[PDB]
Amino acid sequence: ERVGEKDLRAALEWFRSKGYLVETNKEVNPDLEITGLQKIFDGSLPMLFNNVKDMPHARAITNLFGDIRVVEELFGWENSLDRVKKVARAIDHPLKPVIIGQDEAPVQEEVLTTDLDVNKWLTAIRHTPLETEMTIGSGISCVVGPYFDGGSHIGYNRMNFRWGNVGTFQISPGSHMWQVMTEHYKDDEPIPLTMCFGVPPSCTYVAGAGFDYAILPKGCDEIGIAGAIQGSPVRLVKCRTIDAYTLADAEYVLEGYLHPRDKRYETAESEAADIQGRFHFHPEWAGYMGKAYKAPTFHVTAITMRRRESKPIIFPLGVHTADDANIDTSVRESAIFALCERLQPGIVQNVHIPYCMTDWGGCIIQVKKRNQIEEGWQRNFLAAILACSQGMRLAIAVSEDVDIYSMDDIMWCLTTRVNPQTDILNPLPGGRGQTFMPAERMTSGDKQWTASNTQFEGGMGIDATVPYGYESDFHRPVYGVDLVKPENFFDAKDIDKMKSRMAGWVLSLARTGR
Amino acid sequence: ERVGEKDLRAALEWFRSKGYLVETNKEVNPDLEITGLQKIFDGSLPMLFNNVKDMPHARAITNLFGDIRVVEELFGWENSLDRVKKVARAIDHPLKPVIIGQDEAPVQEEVLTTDLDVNKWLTAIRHTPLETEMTIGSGISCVVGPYFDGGSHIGYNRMNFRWGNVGTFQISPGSHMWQVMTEHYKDDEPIPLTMCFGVPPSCTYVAGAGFDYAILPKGCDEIGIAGAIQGSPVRLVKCRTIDAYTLADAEYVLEGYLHPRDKRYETAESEAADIQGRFHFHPEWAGYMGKAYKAPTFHVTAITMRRRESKPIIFPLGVHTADDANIDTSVRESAIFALCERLQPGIVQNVHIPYCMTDWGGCIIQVKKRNQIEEGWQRNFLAAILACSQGMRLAIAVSEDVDIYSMDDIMWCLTTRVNPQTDILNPLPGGRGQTFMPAERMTSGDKQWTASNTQFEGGMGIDATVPYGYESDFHRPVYGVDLVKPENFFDAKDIDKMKSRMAGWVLSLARTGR
Ligand SMILES: CC(C)(COP(=O)(O)OP(=O)(O)OC[C@H]1O[C@@H](n2cnc3c(N)ncnc32)[C@H](O)[C@@H]1OP(=O)(O)O)[C@@H](O)C(=O)NCCC(=O)NCCSC(=O)c1ccccc1
Ligand SMILES: CC(C)(COP(=O)(O)OP(=O)(O)OC[C@H]1O[C@@H](n2cnc3c(N)ncnc32)[C@H](O)[C@@H]1OP(=O)(O)O)[C@@H](O)C(=O)NCCC(=O)NCCSC(=O)c1ccccc1
Ligand SMILES: [Ca+2]
Ligand SMILES: [Ca+2]
Ligand SMILES: [Fe+3]
Ligand SMILES: [Fe+3]
Ligand SMILES: [Fe+3]
Ligand SMILES: [Fe+3]
Ligand SMILES: [K+]
Ligand SMILES: [K+]
């Protein structure tokens, strides 16, 4: 039980071989140093901390998915478009996970069944100095089998263990865990599930997915999609205590039960005066400071991990980082692409969810109309995307002469290609939204800022595409950037001196010439 | 090659055993008698005509799917709700079709490779006296394999063979045949496909499906869904001439090639003066008289059929019949149910598309809100249904105290439960619609009434549901219809005399007491 063929340690070895690994040996605080160093180097190389404060048996990795280029190099993709198409193909073709014995799983070298103090072994962090609680935000849930209709689910859930071996368990309403909890709410037996830590990067990648249930409904095989992404099946193992399955190649696994009707407060102040949605609880995906709520409790029965002499790795990450944004929006991009290809194939060329929009709030699709009969399909695509995403606030459709990765080019399409009377779609006013957007706090009024009181404004679908047959009038003004060579006119020093000053939309426009 | 284990002949034997079969021996005209007798007995028992005018080798069945109760008795379903749930389960679990040899397929007893006059063997009908052409509207297309991404497609296409062995081939834009034609438009080799006639009733049932491609995308297995519906795999056989596969247990098969870039007019008058969308071409699904268009040509290379001494059965049906409505809207109902269950399970209770709405224009879903967090999901459902259906004009969401099969009860919900300022959704103005609705002719103007010139008004999503927490104010007024027995007060004669006068919404209200 010491090999994990494709896991976090092999990924660290590949990162060290490629030269992408930044590793230090100095003792780092989980309090306001890991997330601070992650935000200082946001969207960059992975950082490995060998020594963690008050965690003598644990290492810590961060910014693992921060640069999307090294992630695409890890999984063998050339660019983001190839990544989107390959992960859509992997969604439609899962690899069924294999079950190995309880003696070759590396996560079951040490099995703690007593003295269950989760905060002693797992590294809880604080993100900002405005917080009061150190929370565990590193684990993915793992529901395999009868509670997920014979499929499998992996996904992140934040936990605050402020009762020793009992901690809160934050569930987004509408998610797969919400659907499992809603089905088994009125039950006597609690839901058995495991929280896995230091998982293979494919499992992190698929655990980022969410609110894409027209493509990945309840009963799908998310671990199958992770196995299809890494190109080999993800190994499972039966738990020691509960009746479930874990990722065998993880670094830590918490086994236990979820009690849905046992709801407790996440912080001490919101418990002190009984108010959800007011007190600060570590910044959220929307790009604002989060709020503390009531949440069901996760009753840990066993802590299994690797050997503490091997120093198992945990992956703590801040929420408003490019790390967290890549983790969610990559597989959500390919799911949106899959839905638009299902509705009408051959029209959508590329789907991109930038860091700027949010995890669950926005997307940009790029359509190409081949004839007059395909005119109008972008409005079907925008309405279907906004309806099938639960609280996406802004979907933008652009034409094929646009750089989809530049927000300056998107703003140019918003300025020049949008009729404000006809091209703004508000499809579903009064539907379901995401309560973590404070624009829905503005609709709750003086009631409690919970999901029961918010009112969704309906989303915003912006059709910034060129009408068919008007491609000559909306033609983009390509210059002669390949008809002239600057090496004739200037030397190397003038050329790189002028090239060092360019940044952004000029860098996008100088490649394309438009 | 004389057994078809589950096919049209075995279904006729079961209908005769149950007493549902109405069979005559008098010679019926395909000109204005078959569709007339079908409309006289619309929504009733199957009619079998042994002698057809100028078709001495052919029998004709009609109103086969006219009564939905005998269809549910044929496939083993108790009511329509069980049918919707079972066909949704069959959609998510197809049975892979089997391939049998060319000598046990009953449709290949007689293989005609010369003298290909399709109108000599296949029965073309005229529906109304306003028409001029007798068209073939009995066959389903069958694309299996590489042209459908390794999946299979079955679906109806009307054909008018006015060049001997070359006929038009009407394709709805957006359909599976449209997607196949759009992918292989710019190709030199024509698309090989077979038109199958007198197919098993499961294949007719699944061939009715259309514009449900979030659930049944390109590359799905529609013959697999037919095999899952009948409970045994549908047998296939390799063609004699072209490189394709047919339904082995059919009665007639036309083998040939589809030429997409060879477009010809459907009638003689529209060919005479070059106008699509004006001249009458046999009433359509919208409930209006249809129009003649240009269409790609189907070049028949071989006619294979059963033995002419066995008198193979064809199934001609009028378009504005309950037959045709059941055929499309049954599997489309279960597809809409599957999509709403994928987005958020446990909320939608029942989906119904009545005969009154249309084939592709409307649907009624019935939701049940279990808590405050599920309030608003019906608007997501309405927007997703209207976006993922290509030109559904009217989707209505009602609560669970409504009889979904009574249009009077739906009109009552429209009167009493709709806020006209907030509960009318217009999600996708300017999207793709269905050109056969003349409300989109009103938007084409003085241009040609084609799909290239219509402008969709956006659909109409009506939220007629009760808001959560106001179930006491919107409570339906249940009387004491089971507290009193009429057999005490009156005799049998007064009771059935009073019961014979009740019809419609009073019949719905007297069962429920509301
Ligand atoms: C949505 C709740 C949980 C609603 O609680 P409250 O309003 O306080 O109301 P209650 O709790 O009292 O229950 C009401 C009554 O209804 C019933 N009932 C309830 N549930 C169910 C059920 N499932 N099934 C069936 N029934 C159910 C139940 O009977 C109950 O009555 P009882 O309890 O029997 O007396 C609220 O706590 C909240 O706002 N959570 C935060 C929402 C959120 O957005 N989290 C996002 C995290 S993602 C983010 O971190 C992230 C993303 C990406 C990257 C990074 C980060
Ligand atoms: C939609 C068309 C086919 C458009 O034709 P038109 O407007 O005359 O225009 P054109 O034909 O000239 O082509 C334009 C140019 O664009 C190109 N291009 C075209 N296509 C493609 C392609 N696929 N892929 C790629 N490219 C394509 C092509 O280059 C072409 O130029 P060329 O040809 O190279 O010079 C029209 O004929 C029509 O309205 N059909 C009826 C629509 C309908 O609703 N049928 C519903 C039946 S269901 C009902 O029966 C029913 C349902 C349920 C129960 C019962 C019953
Ligand atoms: Ca992204
Ligand atoms: Ca129906
Ligand atoms: Fe999941
Ligand atoms: Fe526009
Ligand atoms: Fe099909
Ligand atoms: Fe209402
Ligand atoms: K996920
Ligand atoms: K079909």
mmCIF file of N, CA and C and ligand atoms in Angstrom, chain B residues 141 143 148 152-155 175-177 206-207 209-213 216-218 220 222, ligand 7:
data_model
loop_
_atom_site.group_PDB
_atom_site.id
_atom_site.type_symbol
_atom_site.label_atom_id
_atom_site.label_comp_id
_atom_site.label_asym_id
_atom_site.label_seq_id
_atom_site.Cartn_x
_atom_site.Cartn_y
_atom_site.Cartn_z
ATOM 1 N N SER B 141 -37.624 7.074 -41.292
ATOM 2 C CA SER B 141 -36.240 6.970 -41.700
ATOM 3 C C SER B 141 -35.476 6.111 -40.707
ATOM 4 N N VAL B 143 -31.395 5.696 -39.838
ATOM 5 C CA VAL B 143 -29.973 5.960 -40.003
ATOM 6 C C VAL B 143 -29.244 5.318 -38.838
ATOM 7 N N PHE B 148 -24.731 8.534 -37.959
ATOM 8 C CA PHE B 148 -25.341 9.006 -36.726
ATOM 9 C C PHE B 148 -24.445 8.736 -35.523
ATOM 10 N N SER B 152 -28.302 5.506 -33.447
ATOM 11 C CA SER B 152 -29.352 5.167 -34.391
ATOM 12 C C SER B 152 -30.460 6.196 -34.289
ATOM 13 N N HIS B 153 -31.117 6.441 -35.415
ATOM 14 C CA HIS B 153 -32.209 7.396 -35.497
ATOM 15 C C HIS B 153 -33.378 6.763 -36.228
ATOM 16 N N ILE B 154 -34.573 6.923 -35.678
ATOM 17 C CA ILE B 154 -35.805 6.600 -36.376
ATOM 18 C C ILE B 154 -36.729 7.800 -36.289
ATOM 19 N N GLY B 155 -37.383 8.122 -37.392
ATOM 20 C CA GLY B 155 -38.274 9.261 -37.419
ATOM 21 C C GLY B 155 -38.957 9.373 -38.758
ATOM 22 N N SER B 175 -33.742 18.945 -36.744
ATOM 23 C CA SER B 175 -33.964 17.555 -36.382
ATOM 24 C C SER B 175 -32.684 16.740 -36.541
ATOM 25 N N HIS B 176 -32.779 15.439 -36.247
ATOM 26 C CA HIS B 176 -31.620 14.563 -36.390
ATOM 27 C C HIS B 176 -31.229 14.406 -37.846
ATOM 28 N N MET B 177 -32.218 14.326 -38.733
ATOM 29 C CA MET B 177 -31.923 14.269 -40.157
ATOM 30 C C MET B 177 -31.333 15.579 -40.640
ATOM 31 N N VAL B 206 -41.156 5.505 -30.807
ATOM 32 C CA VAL B 206 -39.930 6.283 -30.655
ATOM 33 C C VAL B 206 -39.684 7.158 -31.879
ATOM 34 N N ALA B 207 -40.224 6.780 -33.036
ATOM 35 C CA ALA B 207 -40.084 7.611 -34.223
ATOM 36 C C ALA B 207 -40.903 8.882 -34.109
ATOM 37 N N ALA B 209 -40.743 10.839 -31.585
ATOM 38 C CA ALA B 209 -39.941 11.793 -30.817
ATOM 39 C C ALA B 209 -39.308 12.850 -31.705
ATOM 40 N N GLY B 210 -39.060 14.016 -31.134
ATOM 41 C CA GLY B 210 -38.460 15.082 -31.906
ATOM 42 C C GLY B 210 -38.297 16.315 -31.058
ATOM 43 N N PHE B 211 -37.191 17.015 -31.298
ATOM 44 C CA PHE B 211 -36.835 18.271 -30.643
ATOM 45 C C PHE B 211 -36.777 18.114 -29.128
ATOM 46 N N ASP B 212 -36.010 17.112 -28.729
ATOM 47 C CA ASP B 212 -35.781 16.788 -27.335
ATOM 48 C C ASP B 212 -34.317 16.408 -27.162
ATOM 49 N N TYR B 213 -33.432 17.209 -27.751
ATOM 50 C CA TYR B 213 -32.067 16.764 -27.983
ATOM 51 C C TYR B 213 -31.152 17.037 -26.807
ATOM 52 N N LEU B 216 -32.118 13.338 -25.891
ATOM 53 C CA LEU B 216 -31.806 12.438 -27.000
ATOM 54 C C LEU B 216 -30.982 13.173 -28.045
ATOM 55 N N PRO B 217 -29.701 13.395 -27.791
ATOM 56 C CA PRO B 217 -28.883 14.145 -28.743
ATOM 57 C C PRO B 217 -28.494 13.291 -29.939
ATOM 58 N N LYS B 218 -27.752 13.913 -30.846
ATOM 59 C CA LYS B 218 -27.206 13.190 -31.982
ATOM 60 C C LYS B 218 -26.165 12.191 -31.508
ATOM 61 N N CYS B 220 -27.405 9.280 -30.050
ATOM 62 C CA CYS B 220 -28.147 8.417 -29.152
ATOM 63 C C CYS B 220 -28.677 7.204 -29.908
ATOM 64 N N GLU B 222 -31.980 5.532 -30.645
ATOM 65 C CA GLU B 222 -33.436 5.576 -30.628
ATOM 66 C C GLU B 222 -34.033 4.189 -30.821
HETATM 67 FE FE FE C 7 -33.826 10.731 -34.244
#
